[PDB]
Amino acid sequence: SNKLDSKVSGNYNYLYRLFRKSNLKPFERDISTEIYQAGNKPCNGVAGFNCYFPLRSYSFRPTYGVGHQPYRVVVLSFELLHAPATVCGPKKSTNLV
Amino acid sequence: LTEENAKTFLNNFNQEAEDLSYQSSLASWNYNTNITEENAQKMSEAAAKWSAFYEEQSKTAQSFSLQEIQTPIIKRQLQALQQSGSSALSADKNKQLNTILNTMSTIYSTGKVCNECLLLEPGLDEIMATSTDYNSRLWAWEGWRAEVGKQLRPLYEEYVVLKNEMARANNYNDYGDYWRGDYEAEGADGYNYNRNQLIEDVERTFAEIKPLYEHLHAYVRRKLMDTYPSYISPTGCLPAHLLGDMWGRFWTNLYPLTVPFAQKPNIDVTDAMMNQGWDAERIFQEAEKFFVSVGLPHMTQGFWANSMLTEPADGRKVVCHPTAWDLGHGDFRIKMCTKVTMDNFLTAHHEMGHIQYDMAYARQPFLLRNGANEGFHEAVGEIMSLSAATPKHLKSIGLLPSDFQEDSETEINFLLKQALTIVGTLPFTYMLEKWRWMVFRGEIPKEQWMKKWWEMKREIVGVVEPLPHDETYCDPASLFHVSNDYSFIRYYTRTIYQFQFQEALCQAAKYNGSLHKCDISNSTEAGQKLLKMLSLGNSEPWTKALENVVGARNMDVKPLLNYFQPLFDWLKEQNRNSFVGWNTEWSPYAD
Numbered sequence: 274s275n276k277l278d279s280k281v282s283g284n285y286n287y288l289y290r291l292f293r294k295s296n297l298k299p300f301e302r303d304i305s306t307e308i309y310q311a312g313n314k315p316c317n318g319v320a321g322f323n324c325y326f327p328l329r330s331y332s333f334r335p336t337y338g339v340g341h342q343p344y345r346v347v348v349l350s351f352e353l354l355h356a357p358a359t360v361c362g363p364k365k366s367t368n369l370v
Numbered sequence: 371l372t373e374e375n376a377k378t379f380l381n382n383f384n385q386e387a388e389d390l391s392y393q394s395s396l397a398s399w400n401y402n403t404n405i406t407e408e409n410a411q412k413m414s415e416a417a418a419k420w421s422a423f424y425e426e427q428s429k430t431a432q433s434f435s436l437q438e439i440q441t442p443i444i445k446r447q448l449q450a451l452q453q454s455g456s457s458a459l460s461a462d463k464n465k466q467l468n469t470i471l472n473t474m475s476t477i478y479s480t481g482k483v484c485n486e487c488l489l490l491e492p493g494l495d496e497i498m499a500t501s502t503d504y505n506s507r508l509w510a511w512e513g514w515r516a517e518v519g520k521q522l523r524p525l526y527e528e529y530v531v532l533k534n535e536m537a538r539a540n541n542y543n544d545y546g547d548y549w550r551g552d553y554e555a556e557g558a559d560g561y562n563y564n565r566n567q568l569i570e571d572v573e574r575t576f577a578e579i580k581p582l583y584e585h586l587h588a589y590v591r592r593k594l595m596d597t598y599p600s601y602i603s604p605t606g607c608l609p610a611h612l613l614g615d616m617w618g619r620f621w622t623n624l625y626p627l628t629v630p631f632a633q634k635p636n637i638d639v640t641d642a643m644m645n646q647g648w649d650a651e652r653i654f655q656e657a658e659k660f661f662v663s664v665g666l667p668h669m670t671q672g673f674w675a676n677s678m679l680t681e682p683a684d685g686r687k688v689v690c691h692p693t694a695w696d697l698g699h700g701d702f703r704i705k706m707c708t709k710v711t712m713d714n715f716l717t718a719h720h721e722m723g724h725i726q727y728d729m730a731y732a733r734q735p736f737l738l739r740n741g742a743n744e745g746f747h748e749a750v751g752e753i754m755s756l757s758a759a760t761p762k763h764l765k766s767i768g769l770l771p772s773d774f775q776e777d778s779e780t781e782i783n784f785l786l787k788q789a790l791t792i793v794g795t796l797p798f799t800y801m802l803e804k805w806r807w808m809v810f811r812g813e814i815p816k817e818q819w820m821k822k823w824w825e826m827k828r829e830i831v832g833v834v835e836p837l838p839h840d841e842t843y844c845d846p847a848s849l850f851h852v853s854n855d856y857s858f859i860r861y862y863t864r865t866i867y868q869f870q871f872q873e874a875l876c877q878a879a880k881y882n883g884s885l886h887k888c889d890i891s892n893s894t895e896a897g898q899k900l901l902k903m904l905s906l907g908n909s910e911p912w913t914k915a916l917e918n919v920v921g922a923r924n925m926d927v928k929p930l931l932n933y934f935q936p937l938f939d940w941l942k943e944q945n946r947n948s949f950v951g952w953n954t955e956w957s958p959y960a961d
């Protein structure tokens with residue numbers, strides 16, 4: 274939907290994350306500001322060399338390719354817990370004689 | 371272990387390159403299309419930060435090593451990271467160097483040659499084509515190099531010693547080794563290449579083409595005597611003012627005076643496209659179907675809607691330069707000063723051919739944002755350009771009627787000007803390679819620099835100056851590619867790379883006819899091999915970049931004679947009524 278949610282002055286408001294040392298298990302979150310540890314190094318608390326802080330941002334442009342485009346991804350998930358079901362789907366057609 | 375953390379800084383530098391360097395290419399995309407006085411200011415503000423942020427990563431580049439890398443994917447990914455440049459010395463002599471290159475550029479841009487006083491405009495090549503009198507053109511000839519040769523002499527070689535000082539800091543022999551030693555290859559036992567072997571590697575490439583050249587150089591001696599009898603030696607050399615160009619690398623203007631048969635010249639495309647209605651918007655659509663029917667992927671949709679193909683007639687200042695713009699990441703754009711002429715049609719597949727090579731390294735990051743080296747970038751742009759003059763495509767498109775049958779001599783005509791444009795240019799350019807490969811070292815002394823470039827011109831090229839001059843001339847420095855920061859060896863390396871690419875052009879589509887009349891279209895099974903060589907890019911060394919193409923990993927110019935196989939057997943019975951050889955004592959000014 275790049276025709277509506279972008280401008281030529283820079284749509285870098287949508288941020289992202291490239292890498293981290295650990296592996297996040299699904300169904301939790303982290304807004305943790307954690308320092309990169311390469312090896313024999315202490316923590317300083319400020320950015321610099323080998324303190325690669327992972328606050329990143331994309332490069333959204335309206336003309337930015339046709340395959341490198343913003344895809345608004347909505348992953349809709351369905352759960353059952355052996356319970357009486359509440360969410361019903363679209364029902365059958367109703368006719369009467 | 372910091373092997374993956376050294377990997378982490380690579381795509382961390384690209385994410386600050388997809389928004390910093392990509393707009394600086396987009397700002398330069400904006401300027402040569404739209405020239406305003408404020409468009410240059412954010413051009414200069416972005417292009418300086420383009421270098422300075424690349425200098426910002428050069429400060430942290432020397433903190434890591436180079437021999438602690440085992441896997442070959444980061445072996446070439448990291449050598450471009452540690453390329454410092456000339457930043458180790460202070461501002462005592464580097465800041466003075468750009469003040470030399472600007473005053474050498476103002477004399478070449480605002481140069482006037484008069485006592486009929488004209489700029490370095492295309493008109494400079496216009497008196498060289500049409501006018502044939504010498505006395506009205508003698509003052510324009512000697513006064514051309516009287517205002518350039520004396521001028522740029524005491525400023526040129528102070529530009530070379532600065533890079534020869536910094537070459538051994540980059541483990542190079544000279545500034546020529548920055549031009550010639552860029553073909554590094556490391557890896558296994560058969561992968562290791564050292565730098566100083568290309569000098570012998572280029573000698574025997576022309577040893578098999580010199581019997582073709584003197585067969586073609588004695589071809590032109592028969593008929594130019596009918597136009598200038600009292601100037602040219604009979605069985606020897608040639609004066610310097612009848613070359614079709616001031617340096618003799620453009621032998622295209624002289625072609626009405628060296629045509630094989632005067633009964634039928636070459637076929638142009640400017641007469642019949644005015645009848646069917648195919649203007650400048652039409653054949654570019656068939657140029658895209660020529661690019662996607664050979665297995666290569668389709669063009670982007672933004673290439674159709676957001677591109678500027680045709681000259682904007684809204685009072686727009688356009689540079690009118692055919693150039694391919696590599697923006698990257700699907701921002702595939704083009705500008706070309708488009709008309710319907712044949713020279714525009716041969717380059718119609720050139721800069722448009724680069725985008726299909728830009729999608730070869732579209733997967734490749736910013737540090738390796740070129741071809742497999744500096745040589746294969748311009749070769750694949752020209753691998754479809756020399757095949758664009760194939761006559762079987764010109765008959766099938768519908769310009770000539772079907773009853774026009776192409777004779778055996780019809781191929782001989784345009785392959786001659788093809789031979790005079792590149793193959794005739796190699797004896798001028800190959801001596802220019804050993805020009806800078808020996809003046810940069812220092813075996814030739816200070817005050818004999820004039821005659822040795824002429825001594826290479828009497829023996830190899832056979833071109834003698836007709837007026838006597840003094841030692842303080844810089845006629846090899848009269849090219850703006852040679853004088854300023856441009857590589858000229860990429861012009862000759864473009865030939866010998868695509869000369870072997872025309873060999874793999876034959877077995878890819880299962881071709882069996884004459885190799886100069888090649889058309890890769892009407893075949894989709896050719897493309898399954900074409901996606902093998904372009905998918906590797908610069909991530910693999912250049913010793914692997916030749917193996918997947920032909921199968922041999924050596925330089926071979928035997929497919930050049932396979933490219934002109936009807937021209938060699940025809941040429942034997944033409945100029946045998948002459949003596950072959952060279953006389954290095956003839957001079958026109960022996961008064």
Ligand SMILES: *[C@@H]1O[C@H](CO)[C@@H](O)[C@H](O)[C@H]1NC(C)=O
Binds near residue numbers: 404
């Ligand atoms: C150049 O200016 C014209 C008219 O203002 C505009 O349509 C065009 O997009 C401009 N070029 C670029 C590359 O923005």
Ligand SMILES: *[C@@H]1O[C@H](CO)[C@@H](O)[C@H](O)[C@H]1NC(C)=O
Binds near residue numbers: 762766892
């Ligand atoms: C390729 O196909 C087109 C359309 O069928 C035809 O006009 C053209 O002659 C063919 N080319 C060759 C080399 O057969």
Ligand SMILES: [Zn+2]
Binds near residue numbers: 748752
């Ligand atoms: Zn080229």
